Amino acid sequence: GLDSHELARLHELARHSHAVITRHQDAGGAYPAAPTFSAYRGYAWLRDGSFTAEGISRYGDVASAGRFHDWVDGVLRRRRGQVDDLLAAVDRGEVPSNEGMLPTRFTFDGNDGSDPWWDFQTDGYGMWLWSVVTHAARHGLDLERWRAGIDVAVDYLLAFWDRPCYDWWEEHVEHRHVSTLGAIHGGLVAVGTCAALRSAPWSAATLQVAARIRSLVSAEGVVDGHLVKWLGSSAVDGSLPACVVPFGLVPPDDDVAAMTRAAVAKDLDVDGGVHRFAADVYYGGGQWILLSALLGWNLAAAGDTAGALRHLRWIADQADADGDLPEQVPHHLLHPGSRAEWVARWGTVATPLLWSHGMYLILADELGLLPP
Ligand SMILES: [N+]
């Protein structure tokens, strides 16, 4: 496995991962995506924050993870009226526009950071349900602390799970993305199987809608035995392993899990560095730390420890002088011609990306390698 040279380097990157996340956590509890990247700074995403929170919870910083869940909960409780209004609009048969939906970017004080017409996404609400239930289970916490916020997210996802929206990468609003459906599934199954939430009025509805999501993925989201990027597509996306671990469309030992890991490795993994999708031109379509961590996590869960370690080593090799993990690296580019214009518009690649550090902590924990 690992010699004391490798173990010391991986332990130190875990410690630094914890420090980077907790140093940049907003005073109100939000995890920012990237404190220094021009286009992300000043905003929080539930997607980034939920995976970040899960790495922190595994690391054992109950206080930091708790303040994130407090922040999300309070932000969601403040949208109780908005969600109620959207649902009433549905009940009058007046399907609300993407422009009226709950936002993707949040300011640290819980306001819309962006206009959902341009970035409408439902995945982050599902990831938060997954994250908060997993945290409470891990540390024996009372979910009543966050329940009113959970109620808002559940009511919203039960109404809007089957709507087309932008993917994790803010593309293709007209499509229904299998890793978005997967994130919602993971959230709904988490709350629907949670004994502390057995008396919630939506308890049964969450498992019935999760079953609906799996029906839709079985009908339109599987080709040649593997998951696909969006319903009705043939291609894969680096996000798809999240549909196995942790969101649970299929278990790790399922043939569709195996074939999805194989298809992602073949189409998108170059030397351990995983690309988002074949057409990606963002910074030339580089190799994403969080996707190499996600594939590694899935390989560990399937009993492929070696394949998991190889992806972990690849990630650790992308750490800069200070131990910071970038969003992505250009060792292989899908569209090298596109990179300069991105560096010109937005500057050098987001570093650190807190989500890179969160995913590092999860994969290190899955391999039993966090400092003792
Ligand atoms: N696991």
Short mmCIF file of N, CA, C and O in Angstrom, two decimals, residues 62-74 76-77 128-129 131-137 139-153 197 202:
data_model
loop_
_atom_site.label_atom_id
_atom_site.label_comp_id
_atom_site.label_asym_id
_atom_site.label_seq_id
_atom_site.Cartn_x
_atom_site.Cartn_y
_atom_site.Cartn_z
N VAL A 62 -16.94 18.58 14.39
CA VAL A 62 -18.41 18.62 14.61
C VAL A 62 -18.84 20.08 14.66
O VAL A 62 -19.90 20.40 14.08
N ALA A 63 -18.03 20.95 15.27
CA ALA A 63 -18.38 22.38 15.42
C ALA A 63 -18.48 23.05 14.02
O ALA A 63 -19.51 23.68 13.73
N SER A 64 -17.46 22.92 13.17
CA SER A 64 -17.42 23.58 11.84
C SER A 64 -18.60 23.05 10.98
O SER A 64 -19.33 23.85 10.39
N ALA A 65 -18.75 21.73 10.89
CA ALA A 65 -19.81 21.11 10.06
C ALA A 65 -21.17 21.60 10.58
O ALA A 65 -22.06 21.96 9.75
N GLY A 66 -21.34 21.59 11.90
CA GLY A 66 -22.58 22.08 12.53
C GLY A 66 -22.91 23.52 12.16
O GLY A 66 -24.11 23.85 11.98
N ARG A 67 -21.91 24.40 12.09
CA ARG A 67 -22.18 25.82 11.79
C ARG A 67 -22.62 25.95 10.33
O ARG A 67 -23.44 26.80 10.06
N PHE A 68 -22.09 25.10 9.45
CA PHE A 68 -22.51 25.08 8.02
C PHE A 68 -23.99 24.67 7.94
O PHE A 68 -24.77 25.34 7.27
N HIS A 69 -24.38 23.62 8.64
CA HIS A 69 -25.77 23.09 8.62
C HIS A 69 -26.71 24.13 9.27
O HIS A 69 -27.77 24.36 8.71
N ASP A 70 -26.26 24.83 10.32
CA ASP A 70 -27.01 25.96 10.92
C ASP A 70 -27.26 27.02 9.84
O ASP A 70 -28.41 27.49 9.70
N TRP A 71 -26.22 27.39 9.10
CA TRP A 71 -26.31 28.43 8.06
C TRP A 71 -27.33 28.02 6.99
O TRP A 71 -28.26 28.82 6.68
N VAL A 72 -27.18 26.82 6.46
CA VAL A 72 -28.08 26.33 5.38
C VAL A 72 -29.52 26.31 5.90
O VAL A 72 -30.43 26.81 5.22
N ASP A 73 -29.70 25.71 7.07
CA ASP A 73 -31.02 25.63 7.73
C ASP A 73 -31.67 27.02 7.80
O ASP A 73 -32.81 27.16 7.38
N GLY A 74 -30.97 28.02 8.35
CA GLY A 74 -31.52 29.37 8.50
C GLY A 74 -31.84 29.99 7.13
O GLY A 74 -32.88 30.70 6.97
N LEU A 76 -32.69 28.41 4.39
CA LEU A 76 -33.87 27.68 3.87
C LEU A 76 -35.14 28.10 4.63
O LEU A 76 -36.18 28.31 3.97
N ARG A 77 -35.09 28.16 5.97
CA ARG A 77 -36.26 28.63 6.74
C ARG A 77 -36.73 29.98 6.20
O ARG A 77 -37.95 30.24 6.20
N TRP A 128 -27.74 18.71 0.26
CA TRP A 128 -27.75 19.19 1.66
C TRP A 128 -28.50 18.18 2.52
O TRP A 128 -28.00 17.84 3.63
N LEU A 129 -29.64 17.65 2.05
CA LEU A 129 -30.41 16.67 2.86
C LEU A 129 -29.51 15.48 3.16
O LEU A 129 -29.48 15.03 4.29
N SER A 131 -26.20 15.38 3.17
CA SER A 131 -25.10 15.83 4.04
C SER A 131 -25.55 15.96 5.50
O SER A 131 -24.87 15.37 6.40
N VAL A 132 -26.68 16.61 5.75
CA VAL A 132 -27.11 16.90 7.14
C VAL A 132 -27.54 15.61 7.83
O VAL A 132 -27.15 15.38 8.99
N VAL A 133 -28.22 14.72 7.10
CA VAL A 133 -28.65 13.44 7.71
C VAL A 133 -27.40 12.61 8.01
O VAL A 133 -27.34 11.98 9.11
N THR A 134 -26.44 12.56 7.10
CA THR A 134 -25.22 11.71 7.26
C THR A 134 -24.45 12.23 8.49
O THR A 134 -24.00 11.42 9.32
N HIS A 135 -24.29 13.55 8.61
CA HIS A 135 -23.59 14.19 9.74
C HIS A 135 -24.27 13.82 11.05
O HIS A 135 -23.57 13.42 12.03
N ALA A 136 -25.58 13.97 11.12
CA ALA A 136 -26.33 13.74 12.37
C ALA A 136 -26.20 12.27 12.76
O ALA A 136 -26.03 11.97 13.97
N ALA A 137 -26.24 11.37 11.78
CA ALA A 137 -26.10 9.92 12.01
C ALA A 137 -24.70 9.64 12.55
O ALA A 137 -24.60 8.92 13.57
N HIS A 139 -22.54 11.49 14.20
CA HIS A 139 -22.15 12.10 15.49
C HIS A 139 -23.29 12.05 16.51
O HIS A 139 -23.14 12.67 17.56
N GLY A 140 -24.36 11.32 16.24
CA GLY A 140 -25.47 11.13 17.20
C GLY A 140 -26.17 12.43 17.55
O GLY A 140 -26.50 12.62 18.75
N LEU A 141 -26.46 13.28 16.56
CA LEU A 141 -27.06 14.61 16.80
C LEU A 141 -28.56 14.55 16.55
O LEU A 141 -29.01 13.66 15.79
N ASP A 142 -29.30 15.45 17.17
CA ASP A 142 -30.76 15.57 17.02
C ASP A 142 -31.05 16.41 15.76
O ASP A 142 -30.80 17.61 15.78
N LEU A 143 -31.65 15.81 14.74
CA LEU A 143 -32.00 16.50 13.48
C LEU A 143 -33.08 17.54 13.71
O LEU A 143 -33.23 18.39 12.82
N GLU A 144 -33.75 17.58 14.84
CA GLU A 144 -34.72 18.66 15.09
C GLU A 144 -34.01 20.03 15.03
O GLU A 144 -34.68 21.03 14.75
N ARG A 145 -32.71 20.06 15.29
CA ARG A 145 -31.93 21.33 15.21
C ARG A 145 -32.10 21.95 13.81
O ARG A 145 -32.00 23.18 13.68
N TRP A 146 -32.23 21.13 12.77
CA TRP A 146 -32.20 21.60 11.36
C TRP A 146 -33.52 21.24 10.65
O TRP A 146 -33.62 21.47 9.41
N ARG A 147 -34.50 20.71 11.38
CA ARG A 147 -35.72 20.09 10.77
C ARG A 147 -36.53 21.10 9.94
O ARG A 147 -36.99 20.70 8.85
N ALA A 148 -36.77 22.33 10.42
CA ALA A 148 -37.62 23.31 9.69
C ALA A 148 -36.96 23.63 8.34
O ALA A 148 -37.70 23.82 7.36
N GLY A 149 -35.63 23.61 8.25
CA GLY A 149 -34.92 23.85 6.99
C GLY A 149 -35.04 22.63 6.10
O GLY A 149 -35.28 22.76 4.87
N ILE A 150 -34.90 21.46 6.72
CA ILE A 150 -35.13 20.17 6.00
C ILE A 150 -36.53 20.17 5.36
O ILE A 150 -36.63 19.76 4.18
N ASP A 151 -37.56 20.59 6.12
CA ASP A 151 -38.98 20.67 5.65
C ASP A 151 -39.07 21.52 4.40
O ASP A 151 -39.72 21.11 3.43
N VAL A 152 -38.35 22.65 4.34
CA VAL A 152 -38.41 23.53 3.16
C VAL A 152 -37.79 22.78 1.98
O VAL A 152 -38.41 22.76 0.89
N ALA A 153 -36.61 22.19 2.15
CA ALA A 153 -35.89 21.52 1.05
C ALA A 153 -36.72 20.33 0.53
O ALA A 153 -36.85 20.13 -0.68
N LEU A 197 -36.83 10.88 11.61
CA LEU A 197 -37.81 11.62 10.81
C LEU A 197 -39.01 10.73 10.42
O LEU A 197 -39.75 11.11 9.51
N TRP A 202 -44.08 14.02 5.19
CA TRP A 202 -43.51 13.69 3.86
C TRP A 202 -42.70 12.39 3.92
O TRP A 202 -42.10 12.04 2.89
#
